[PDB]
Amino acid sequence: ISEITYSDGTVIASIDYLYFTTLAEAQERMYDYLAQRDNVSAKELKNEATQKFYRDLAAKEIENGGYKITTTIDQKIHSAMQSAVADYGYLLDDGTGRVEVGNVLMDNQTGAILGFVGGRNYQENQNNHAFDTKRSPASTTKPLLAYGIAIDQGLMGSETILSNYPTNFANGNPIMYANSKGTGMMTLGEALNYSWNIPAYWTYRMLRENGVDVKGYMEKMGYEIPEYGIESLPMGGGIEVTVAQHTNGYQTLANNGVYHQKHVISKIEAADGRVVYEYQDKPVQVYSKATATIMQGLLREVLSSRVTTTFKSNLTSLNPTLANADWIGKTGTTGQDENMWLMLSTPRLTLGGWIGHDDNHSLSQQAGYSNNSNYMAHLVNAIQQASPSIWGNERFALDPSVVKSEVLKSTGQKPGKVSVEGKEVEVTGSTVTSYWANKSGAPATSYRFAIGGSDADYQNAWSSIVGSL
Amino acid sequence: ISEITYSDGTVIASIESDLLDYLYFTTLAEAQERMYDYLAQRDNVSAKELKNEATQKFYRDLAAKEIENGGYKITTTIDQKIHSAMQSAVADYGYLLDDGTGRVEVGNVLMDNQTGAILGFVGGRNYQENQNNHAFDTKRSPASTTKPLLAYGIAIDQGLMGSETILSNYPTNFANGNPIMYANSKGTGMMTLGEALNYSWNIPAYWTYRMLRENGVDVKGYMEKMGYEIPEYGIESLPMGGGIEVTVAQHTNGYQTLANNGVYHQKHVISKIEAADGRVVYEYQDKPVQVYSKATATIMQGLLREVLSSRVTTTFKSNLTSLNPTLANADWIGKTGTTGQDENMWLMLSTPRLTLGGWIGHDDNHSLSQQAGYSNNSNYMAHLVNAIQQASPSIWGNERFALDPSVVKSEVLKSTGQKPGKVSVEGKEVEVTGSTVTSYWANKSGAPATSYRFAIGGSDADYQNAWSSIVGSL
Ligand SMILES: *[B-](O)(O)c1cc(NC(C)=O)cc(C(=O)O)c1
Ligand SMILES: *[B-](O)(O)c1cc(NC(C)=O)cc(C(=O)O)c1
Ligand SMILES: [Cl-]
Ligand SMILES: [Cl-]
Ligand SMILES: [Cl-]
Ligand SMILES: [Cl-]
Ligand SMILES: [Cl-]
Ligand SMILES: [Cl-]
Ligand SMILES: [Cl-]
Ligand SMILES: [Cl-]
Ligand SMILES: [Cl-]
Ligand SMILES: [Cl-]
Ligand SMILES: [Cl-]
Ligand SMILES: [Cl-]
Ligand SMILES: [Cl-]
Ligand SMILES: [Cl-]
Ligand SMILES: [Cl-]
Ligand SMILES: [Cl-]
Ligand SMILES: [Cl-]
Ligand SMILES: [Cl-]
Ligand SMILES: [Cl-]
Ligand SMILES: [Cl-]
Ligand SMILES: [Cl-]
Ligand SMILES: [Cl-]
Ligand SMILES: [Cl-]
Ligand SMILES: [Cl-]
Ligand SMILES: [Cl-]
Ligand code: NA
Ligand code: NA
Ligand code: NA
Numbered sequence: 001i002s003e004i005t006y007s008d009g010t011v012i013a014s015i016d017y018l019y020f021t022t023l024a025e026a027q028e029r030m031y032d033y034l035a036q037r038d039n040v041s042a043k044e045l046k047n048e049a050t051q052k053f054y055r056d057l058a059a060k061e062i063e064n065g066g067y068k069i070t071t072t073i074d075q076k077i078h079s080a081m082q083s084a085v086a087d088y089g090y091l092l093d094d095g096t097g098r099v100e101v102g103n104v105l106m107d108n109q110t111g112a113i114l115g116f117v118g119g120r121n122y123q124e125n126q127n128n129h130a131f132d133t134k135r136s137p138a139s140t141t142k143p144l145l146a147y148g149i150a151i152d153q154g155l156m157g158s159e160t161i162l163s164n165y166p167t168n169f170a171n172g173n174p175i176m177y178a179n180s181k182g183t184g185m186m187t188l189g190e191a192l193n194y195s196w197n198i199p200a201y202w203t204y205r206m207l208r209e210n211g212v213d214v215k216g217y218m219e220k221m222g223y224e225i226p227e228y229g230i231e232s233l234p235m236g237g238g239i240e241v242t243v244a245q246h247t248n249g250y251q252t253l254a255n256n257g258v259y260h261q262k263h264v265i266s267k268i269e270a271a272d273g274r275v276v277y278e279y280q281d282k283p284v285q286v287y288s289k290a291t292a293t294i295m296q297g298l299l300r301e302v303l304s305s306r307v308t309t310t311f312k313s314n315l316t317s318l319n320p321t322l323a324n325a326d327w328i329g330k331t332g333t334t335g336q337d338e339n340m341w342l343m344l345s346t347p348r349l350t351l352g353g354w355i356g357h358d359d360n361h362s363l364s365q366q367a368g369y370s371n372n373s374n375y376m377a378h379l380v381n382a383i384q385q386a387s388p389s390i391w392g393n394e395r396f397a398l399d400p401s402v403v404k405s406e407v408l409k410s411t412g413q414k415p416g417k418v419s420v421e422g423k424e425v426e427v428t429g430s431t432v433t434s435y436w437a438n439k440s441g442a443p444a445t446s447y448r449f450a451i452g453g454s455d456a457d458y459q460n461a462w463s464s465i466v467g468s469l
Numbered sequence: 470i471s472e473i474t475y476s477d478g479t480v481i482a483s484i485e486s487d488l489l490d491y492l493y494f495t496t497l498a499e500a501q502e503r504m505y506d507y508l509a510q511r512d513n514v515s516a517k518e519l520k521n522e523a524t525q526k527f528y529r530d531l532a533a534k535e536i537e538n539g540g541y542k543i544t545t546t547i548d549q550k551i552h553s554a555m556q557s558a559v560a561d562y563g564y565l566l567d568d569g570t571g572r573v574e575v576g577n578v579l580m581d582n583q584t585g586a587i588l589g590f591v592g593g594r595n596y597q598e599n600q601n602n603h604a605f606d607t608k609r610s611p612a613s614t615t616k617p618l619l620a621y622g623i624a625i626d627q628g629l630m631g632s633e634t635i636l637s638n639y640p641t642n643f644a645n646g647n648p649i650m651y652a653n654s655k656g657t658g659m660m661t662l663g664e665a666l667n668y669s670w671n672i673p674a675y676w677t678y679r680m681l682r683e684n685g686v687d688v689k690g691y692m693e694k695m696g697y698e699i700p701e702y703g704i705e706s707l708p709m710g711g712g713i714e715v716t717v718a719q720h721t722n723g724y725q726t727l728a729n730n731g732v733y734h735q736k737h738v739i740s741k742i743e744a745a746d747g748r749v750v751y752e753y754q755d756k757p758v759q760v761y762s763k764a765t766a767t768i769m770q771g772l773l774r775e776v777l778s779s780r781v782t783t784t785f786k787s788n789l790t791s792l793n794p795t796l797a798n799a800d801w802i803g804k805t806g807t808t809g810q811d812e813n814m815w816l817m818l819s820t821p822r823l824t825l826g827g828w829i830g831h832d833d834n835h836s837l838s839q840q841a842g843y844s845n846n847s848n849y850m851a852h853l854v855n856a857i858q859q860a861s862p863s864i865w866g867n868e869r870f871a872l873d874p875s876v877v878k879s880e881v882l883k884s885t886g887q888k889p890g891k892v893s894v895e896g897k898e899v900e901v902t903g904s905t906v907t908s909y910w911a912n913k914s915g916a917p918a919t920s921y922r923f924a925i926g927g928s929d930a931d932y933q934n935a936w937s938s939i940v941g942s943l
Binding site: 074091306310312314315316317318320370373374378 | 565780785787788789790791792793844848852853
């Protein structure tokens with residue numbers, strides 16, 4: 001009778017979060033294997049009755065067969081993660097009841113899942129918040145769906161300027177962030193650190209205007225998103241993901257643009273040793289190396305800046321060496337504080353983390369900012385203790401293909417002549433290196449130098465700019 | 470022969486004559502200052518004679534001899550378990566300060582808010598390597614930790630602003646024509662007190678101090694009640710710490726005053742000297758002074774609570790949270806400091822029971838790294854605050870700072886920090902309206918009606934520009 005092992009061949013069980021997660025995945029691979037073995041047509045496989053039967057026939061196969069199921073799970077690491085959430089999960093409770101939690105640690109280079117947190121305590125609550133739970137990824141959407149795609153397309157670079165000026169949705173309601181209706185122009189860096197919404201709204205809207213196949217990108221990463229025609233899409237509206245699937249997105253950015261499909265099972269072998277399933281590596285360059293490495297740079301500072309997450313502070317206090325790893329990441333917070341995300345990467349690993357309530361009520365305001373950040377610092381340390389060089393010491397680095405431009409700070413763009421209602425101006429001032437992922441680098445400065453902005457906005461910004469020579 | 474004891478009576482050391490450790494020198498030195506004052510007054514020397522240098526030297530010599538040969542018991546306020554714990558903390562965690570500019574030195578004073586007793590201190594990285602006492606001897610500019618005491622606290626006390634009053638942070642020059650800078654920023658716009666505190670902007674502080682001069686406020690009087698020695702008050706950048714130099718111990722005494730509801734207790738490390746024959750030659754006398762009203766102090770507490778919790782200029786609450794979440798939930802308030810070339814970092818922390826002063830920098834005054842104060846010092850002091858807890862788990866207390874009853878509350882416009890009402894904007898009189906906030910004052914009657922110059926500071930151009938904005942939003 002059959003076995004599931006850790007990656008080193010150590011038996012997990014013969015046929016708790018660990019048990020069911022790995023088994024359910026093994027059964028899903030067994031389901032595929034049998035449907036292909038019986039030549040079940042794709043029409044047939046859509047049939048509900050057929051699915052039940054084959055779901056049931058895969059389950060019995062594992063029980064009765066004598067298969068070895070090799071998982072990707074690292075015993076020391078996964079176990080250290082269980083202790084972590086046991087020891088430190090209480091840091092999440094903030095007076096809104098018992099806060100649940102999902103984490104997935106993924107190898108950036110393989111997609112393998114080394115260990116995971118399923119929830120506060122399987123014995124109290126059996127919902128798997130790492131693999132099953134689907135929640136809006138909120139602002140963690142932005143680097144993937146908006147900004148990363150805009151850069152990859154050549155429509156934006158590291159120090160391009162976006163409008164966070166007040167603006168409304170089609171219905172007339174103001175696009176909000178926290179309680180702000182917006183401010184003014186702003187670099188991509190600042191838009192990312194503070195997690196503004198308006199800048200993301202204009203970015204997505206620009207992608208639609210340029211006809212960019214955004215679905216194409218998201219699908220290459222395994223994202224199932226049913227409707228792309230949504231103005232708040234890039235802020236995580238109309239999207240729902242597992243922590244495992246979402247971790248896979250950040251795995252893509254971290255792995256210099258190259259997707260590896262997540263997996264928890266690497267091999268199933270019949271009792272006579274014939275492989276019935278084995279994981280096939282299909283790297284996929286979702287973003288250009290320039291794009292991914294440019295994005296790595298920005299997400300480095302999302303964490304450094306500490307604007308929306310205290311994480312680096314927390315990690316520094318618990319483990320100052322570890323804190324010097326080249327961490328990058330992105331927070332998410334849903335509009336009523338229903339869900340907090342913190343996504344973290346070093347060159348080697350990605351660790352995704354969600355918290356919230358099962359019934360979807362609000363957390364405290366600081367639940368993502370402080371609590372989750374603190375918790376994940378403890379979790380990241382606990383993985384370190386268990387496997388001391390697993391995080392690695394590599395730095396993320398700009399790909400040589402990255403083009404570097406001299407732009408004005410004020411416009412995001414090369415200095416140049418511009419007309420400001422009549423009066424042409426020679427536009428001059430302090431400059432910055434901007435990183436682009438196109439052939440040619442930044443354009444020269446135009447009147448509409450920014451992503452988004454009304455006319456009014458533009459004669460307000462140009463006002464100050466002109467003032468400032 | 471003579472002995473210096475911890476506060477429970479344990480012996481720290483014997484004083485006998487020499488042939489021809491911070492704790493020894495610090496406690497002995499203050500004991501000799503006491504013996505000095507005693508011997509002088511026993512002999513009826515007057516401030517006339519005691520101004521004469523041959524006479525000081527005589528009475529300093531006499532006080533040394535007296536403790537060396539006499540049979541005095543000297544009782545210090547030092548708490549042995551806590552002080553030890555602090556020596557351990559700097560030993561274990563001092564390296565957290567080293568940022569690549571060399572060996573960063575450090576001074577700390579833990580003070581009891583209710584008496585001014587010093588319970589323990591850190592004198593430097595390692596007395597062996599360097600004997601400069603950075604807790605008691607080194608004087609440095611308190612930088613922006615000047616602002617609550619010299620500027621905003623006094624303004625509130627004098628009824629010239631309240632908790633949500635607006636201040637100008639629009640660009641402006643010193644009298645010589647140079648811009649008042651903060652980091653690289655030439656300024657922004659109008660600003661609540663709270664925001665001005667959390668970011669530690671300079672211009673609001675500049676204007677605040679200017680106001681107090683225009684109003685002839687006795688700022689020296691306040692600072693002196695707290696033991697501060699500032700030689701020259703006519704200095705534009707005073708409130709930012711310009712032309713001020715202080716020990717960690719003196720400066721801890723200033724934050725003690727705000728923390729103890731406005732009431733100052735003079736710092737001391739010695740509570741009693743007693744002779745063998747029963748003669749008490751010195752015993753510390755409790756002499757509370759109300760420097761700020763309880764209203765002012767408790768309002769200030771609320772603002773300093775958020776300086777820490779906003780995490781703008783320090784990571785401390787984050788650091789402490791990860792080290793000791795329960796302790797991070799005590800009622801911490803504080804203020805940071807950074808001199809203009811990054812030479813000096815300060816963090817001043819209080820709970821209702823204790824104040825902990827912290828300075829870091831280099832004995833030769835060269836620059837620290839840019840984040841030394843924001844991050845390094847904040848992290849170290851969270852380690853230090855925690856180590857103090859471990860040694861004495863109730864010492865910090867679970868009490869909360871709270872507004873005194875005497876605090877006046879007012880409904881004001883968020884835009885103007887003043888009560889809603891009509892204003893004359895450039896000819897046409899306007900119905901100044903919008904969302905409100907509760908603002909705390911330490912006067913009789915609270916906020917005024919909004920006037921054209923609602924803010925502390927600002928030029929005509931500035932006020933135009935800001936009203937421009939406010940009129941828009943109606
Ligand atoms: B983000 O910082 O997680 C974020 C995302 C949104 N998106 C949507 C669709 O509401 C809103 C907000 C916010 O207004 O706080 C933040
Ligand atoms: B403060 O945030 O510690 C502060 C204080 C000063 N003071 C003086 C006298 O220059 C300057 C600055 C600064 O230029 O950043 C900050
Ligand atoms: Cl293993
Ligand atoms: Cl920023
Ligand atoms: Cl699409
Ligand atoms: Cl999905
Ligand atoms: Cl569509
Ligand atoms: Cl799998
Ligand atoms: Cl077999
Ligand atoms: Cl950092
Ligand atoms: Cl922080
Ligand atoms: Cl280039
Ligand atoms: Cl260029
Ligand atoms: Cl191009
Ligand atoms: Cl317009
Ligand atoms: Cl000394
Ligand atoms: Cl003691
Ligand atoms: Cl603020
Ligand atoms: Cl004065
Ligand atoms: Cl002084
Ligand atoms: Cl004067
Ligand atoms: Cl005697
Ligand atoms: Cl009073
Ligand atoms: Cl009242
Ligand atoms: Cl009122
Ligand atoms: Cl009054
Ligand atoms: Cl003017
Ligand atoms: Na966020
Ligand atoms: Na060191
Ligand atoms: Na400061």
